Write a protein that binds this ligand. Structure first.
Ligand SMILES: CCCCNC(=O)[C@@H](NC(=O)N(C)Cc1ccc2c(c1C(=O)O)OCO2)c1ccccc1
Ligand SMILES: CCCCNC(=O)[C@@H](NC(=O)N(C)Cc1ccc2c(c1C(=O)O)OCO2)c1ccccc1
Ligand SMILES: [Cl-]
Ligand SMILES: [Cl-]
Lengths: 149, 149
């Protein structure tokens, strides 16, 4: 499970926040996009897979699962695309909670950032650095290091 | 050592490619921007520091070193800004060589990507995954994991 990620799309200020969560650690990367198109999702996954060893992605919905451009990016990057259907129901609630938590952080920084995209990146930072005692950033690095060795 | 990054700005197709290199591993993150401004650099560093434990950045030039927006991002993210002056002179040539490498990769994929930004992300992927026998992606995870424990 060191290579497993989940896509998550949430909305705020009439914009779309696209999130990738590393399932085993809770570590995230996120971007603001105008709308959640196959093309945007494909580009986001290319960026993600160049940065971390992404083996499997649970896509966030059937449109992206279907998307020719998403399928092309996954092929290019060596990613196995899977559905993101919560056969374990506690999955959906974990996501919902993260979306709520991310929006909360965004609200707390919203003041220090002129643009939504800045506040989202501040939120990524705070989320990944939060000690819970290791942080998500520490967990993902330990998980993947153990996997290499 | 595990926390040290160098900024590097290179040009192609009339656009700017902004690179951050993890000095100890050769691992990189990169983006295409229309122009290298303080605001763009500041945003790039915010994103980088939310994703990896960035302690020190050797900035690529004195305009970004001076930039009040870059200084504000570095303050926000807990980054020590340093100059990028190569007291070790083999530094310039290492950068120069990576820029040449990156541009070569971009040329090799240039055909598979409509947009420069896609080709740059493909080049980041190929760079970070190349076995050298570990890859840069493997090196950065082991360096930082060793540092955590
Ligand atoms: C309403 C509160 C406004 C107080 N903050 C500021 O005046 C400046 N913000 C910063 O110094 N930083 C660290 C954040 C930041 C960094 C880079 C960027 C940004 C932002 C951003 O704020 O969204 O936008 C695009 O490139 C600022 C800088 C540039 C443009 C606008 C604002
Ligand atoms: C010159 C030969 C072009 C052959 N490739 C294609 O037709 C498509 N490319 C892909 O399937 N992928 C994986 C790459 C990609 C992914 C996502 C994106 C992209 C690109 C990109 O190509 O730049 O642009 C922004 O969002 C394509 C898709 C959408 C727009 C344009 C092209
Ligand atoms: Cl990788
Ligand atoms: Cl981190």
């Amino acid at each position: 499970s060191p290579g497993i990620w989940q896509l998550d799309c949430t909305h705020l200020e009439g914009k779309v926040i696209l999130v990738a969560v590393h399932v085993a650690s809770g570590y995230i990367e996120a971007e603001v996009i105008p709308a959640e198109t196959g093309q945007e999702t494909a580009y986001f996954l290319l960026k993600l897979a160049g940065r971390w060893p992404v083996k499997t992605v649970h896509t966030d919905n059937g449109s992206n699962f279907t998307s020719t451009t998403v399928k092309a990016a996954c092929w290019w990057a060596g990613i196995k695309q899977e559905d993101g259907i919560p056969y374990n129901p506690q999955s959906q609630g974990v996501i919902e909670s993260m979306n709520k938590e991310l929006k909360k952080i965004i609200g707390q920084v919203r003041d220090q950032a002129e643009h939504l995209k800045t506040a989202v990146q501040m939120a990524v930072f705070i989320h990944n650095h939060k000690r819970k005692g290791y942080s998500a950033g520490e967990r993902i690095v330990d998980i993947i290091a153990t996997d290499i060795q």
